[PDB]
Amino acid sequence: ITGEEQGVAVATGTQPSAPAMATLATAATGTMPEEWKTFFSYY
Amino acid sequence: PSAPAMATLATAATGTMPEEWKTFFSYYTTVNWSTTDETGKVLFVQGLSPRMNPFLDHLAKMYTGWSGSMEIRFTISGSGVFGGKLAAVMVPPGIGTEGGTSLLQFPHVLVDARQTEPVIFNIPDIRTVLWHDMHDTLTAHLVILVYNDLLNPYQNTTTGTSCTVTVETRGGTDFEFHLLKPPSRKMIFGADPSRLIPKKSMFWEGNRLPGEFKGFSIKPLVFQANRHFDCKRQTFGWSTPEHAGVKLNIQRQNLDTEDKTDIGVHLVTGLKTIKSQVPDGWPDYYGRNIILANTTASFGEVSEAMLGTVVPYRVSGKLEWRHLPEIAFANGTAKNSTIVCGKYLTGNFYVGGNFTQQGNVVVYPAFWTSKHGDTKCIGEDEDMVKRIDVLPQAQTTGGNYPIYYVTEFPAAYLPAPRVYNSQLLWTSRLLAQDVYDIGPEALAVFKIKDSAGNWFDIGISCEGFSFVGAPTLPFSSLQFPLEASYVGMASAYNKLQHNIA
Amino acid sequence: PDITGEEQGVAVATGTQPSAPAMATLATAATGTMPEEWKTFFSYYTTVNWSTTDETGKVLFVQGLSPRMNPFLDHLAKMYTGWSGSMEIRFTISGSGVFGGKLAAVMVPPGIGTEGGTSLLQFPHVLVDARQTEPVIFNIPDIRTVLWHDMHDTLTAHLVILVYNDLLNPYQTSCTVTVETRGGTDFEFHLLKPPSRKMIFGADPSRLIPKKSMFWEGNRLPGEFKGFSIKPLVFQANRHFDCKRQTFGWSTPEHAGVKLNIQRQNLDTEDKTDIGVHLVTGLKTIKSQVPDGWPDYYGRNIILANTTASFGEVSEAMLGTVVPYRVSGKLEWRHLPEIAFANGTAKNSTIVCGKYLTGNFYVGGNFTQQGNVVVYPAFWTSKHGDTKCIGEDEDMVKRIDVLPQAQTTGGNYPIYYVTEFPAAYLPAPRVYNSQLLWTSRLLAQDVYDIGPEALAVFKIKDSAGNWFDIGISCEGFSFVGAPTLPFSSLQFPLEASYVGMASAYNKLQHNIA
Amino acid sequence: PIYYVTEFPAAYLPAPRVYNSQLLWTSRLLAQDVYDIGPEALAVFKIKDSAGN
């Protein structure tokens, strides 16, 4: 069966951490996703 | 007198839907997947060109442009036992297929070696312009890489085991030719390069010397001037392509050796010229510094002669000539029964033969003397090819190698005697009278069939040299009844494919 | 499941799919297209000449309905096996308003005979004046007996352009008429094939005469083609091949020399005054002991004398230039001279040559070694009093067997193709040929359907619009339908089109200024 | 560990060669700036020959 690009594949893990640590990091530094398209830059 | 009725009855009898070449898939190639093909190895590269599907191949000759996508139908026909994974990568237009392993960092679909159904790929039609032109190569590519090697559990036959991948093509739902053109009409910047290689081997003459085709040779380098014509009508040789032989005016012994011991040398006049001073049909390959000493009668003492057969021309009378025997060709004034000069067609042209009468005559290159030690086809040597002012050439063009066509010519010591030919005679007659589509960065590709599934692409460049993918393919394995079949315009920098036992 | 259909397979999307419909619409707008463009407009087909000398009822243009009538349909036809429907004819006369005459197009139904004569005016004709100053548009209905037509059907409808009123010319010239064709609304191809899948059975007569004069080599001696000649009787033994692959000759179509072997013996002629002679053994033979490729024409009674100086012989046998066959050493041969060919018995120094190639074979030449050689027939002459082209004389045409021969046949005169050969004091040297070389290669490799009383008629066309019909008989001989016509006028770069199967003993057609 | 091998002429030594701790460029850099490679870390560069080895 043809396997997709995006990944048709199976997920696996063992004893993982949380995703709230991602929120912790996002708090640490307020990095909105696509910033560079927001502010001019000297030329 | 007529009726629609009659047309209705014919549709009943025969079932034709009025444009049904767009519905089915048609054969394109078969690519061998070996149990010895290393990861990343490129199985299959093919840029979007209408020229694939035979039917669009036909219809294209009648159109100036094209658009839309096309479909590729793979049939992976392995056993249920074989393990293996085949990668499919679409290359954004203009990015090269340089090296397999890398490409894999594109987005890519995986195709398993044990698939029960064929796979249909729609090569996208990414374009910057509203409609393409019949020669445009800056198109999206499809690359089929090997991702995990073809595992066969069985190794009792230890090596050389294989699987078969057959390719079929169709117009996409949206493929549509654009501008109607008469068949046979030359497009601006070139004629249709389809008519370059005859269809059948039977018709294959070499451009160097007349003979029956006997196979192909591969070299790292390639070089020929005479009767070699580029895609764009330029030609650095000196001859019209007709193998008519070279017909000359014979001057008497006025500059023949005066202290001779052997058959004399006679300065001649070309009478027809393409290039100044050069007789039309001067044999291109012969030894430098030839010695005509000891040339009593036999000529077999000469090292690299190009002996020619002789016959009279527009004599209009009693044949006052003597018994015209054979000629040795030469070039370069000498102080004795020798011919010193070489490397260039600057010097005066001379004729080795027992001639006494002044007049005009035809001579054909007819036999090759050689040194007793020859193991080399006529034209192996740069040093012996003859230049006017420039030798064209080709070397490995992005992993693609130049080929010489090989043909028989009678040639003294050499067992199985051969001459190397740059261009097929056909390809030469054309490309003389017409300009051809082969772009500066192009490679017009042909497909050479014999039997047993043997095939190998030959491609023609701008310069008009024949190219091949790999450098050592066993030509020895082929069957004579070769057949050519145009393919398309492949990007010069790609690798040409090859599939032979 | 296991079964796989003509159009099936998993659909897979890779990478960037760029919204096909929008771009397709953009392109469609960029260049409008109808379902079949080649049916909306008229395409140049053929021009035919019209001379003041043309009596009433002279046929100008004969064209049985086919796809070949139009360029685009002609090219498409490669992809199909069958056709149906009508074709629209647009024809024009161009001429000075001073000229006067009328021309009548009639759509001849299949069963009618397409010859001239005033009776052909008497069924629905459309007529054009030399002053009309407008194309006239008339339709060719597709009358059939069979539900659809094959690609070679000879039962098709016919178009004849007659001279109605002669072409008067106040001053004292040839006008020109052009034909433009168009697919009808009803035209429709049928069973679909790949091109490169050659026509039916590989027995197709269309593969006989090459489409361009660039390839028209002759079957008697090598060289580039110079037109045709008419004769009351036409004959040749060698390289002549019948419908049935029967050949009374002694040669394969190869036309690449004679593969012979020389015996050292000088045959003890006069030590002077002649080059002596060697007997010959052929390395190869298609028939009886006959070496492959002796010249079919040369003088009997070859008096070799004084020949030591040069080949000044009368009534020549072919002089031929010589090569060593192949060797493993340096070169065993010496100073190979020009050969002169001969057959029969060496009764004397001179070789007694018969009309028949039954005797031993001999060559005049200063040989002394033994070895294999190849010789090419390369020069000829006769006595100064002669002007006859090579192959004209019955007697000099050499025979093993029955000498095939074509008589003036049912209003048709057999023809020789003429090509040039190197020869001297024979003004404009020519050699006569029963066949083209392509019609010798073929007819060797394949059997054909050429009927016992049927001819395969080909339309050979000048540039200047002239045309005439050449038909290949079961015997392989070419025929045309006049005792004499001005081939002198013929422009050298001809083309041929296959016209179909026509009964032998019906006259052939011709239209030359 | 590895030696970058290069050729400069010598006597009596077939296939003359020299051993090198660092490419010239890998030395030019590491002079001009403080690259952040750690005490127990390796900056890994993948070397692909033509043909894929």
From TrEMBL, chain A:
<comment type="similarity">
    <text>Belongs to the caliciviridae capsid protein family.</text>
</comment>
<protein>
    <recommendedName>
        <fullName>Capsid protein VP1</fullName>
    </recommendedName>
</protein>
From TrEMBL, chain C:
<dbReference type="GO" id="GO:0039617">
    <property type="term" value="C:T=3 icosahedral viral capsid"/>
</dbReference>
<keyword id="KW-0167">Capsid protein</keyword>
<keyword id="KW-1035">Host cytoplasm</keyword>
<keyword id="KW-1142">T=3 icosahedral capsid protein</keyword>
<protein>
    <recommendedName>
        <fullName>Capsid protein VP1</fullName>
    </recommendedName>
</protein>
<feature type="domain" description="Calicivirus coat protein">
    <location>
        <begin position="1"/>
        <end position="260"/>
    </location>
</feature>
<dbReference type="GO" id="GO:0030430">
    <property type="term" value="C:host cell cytoplasm"/>
</dbReference>
<keyword id="KW-0946">Virion</keyword>
<comment type="similarity">
    <text>Belongs to the caliciviridae capsid protein family.</text>
</comment>
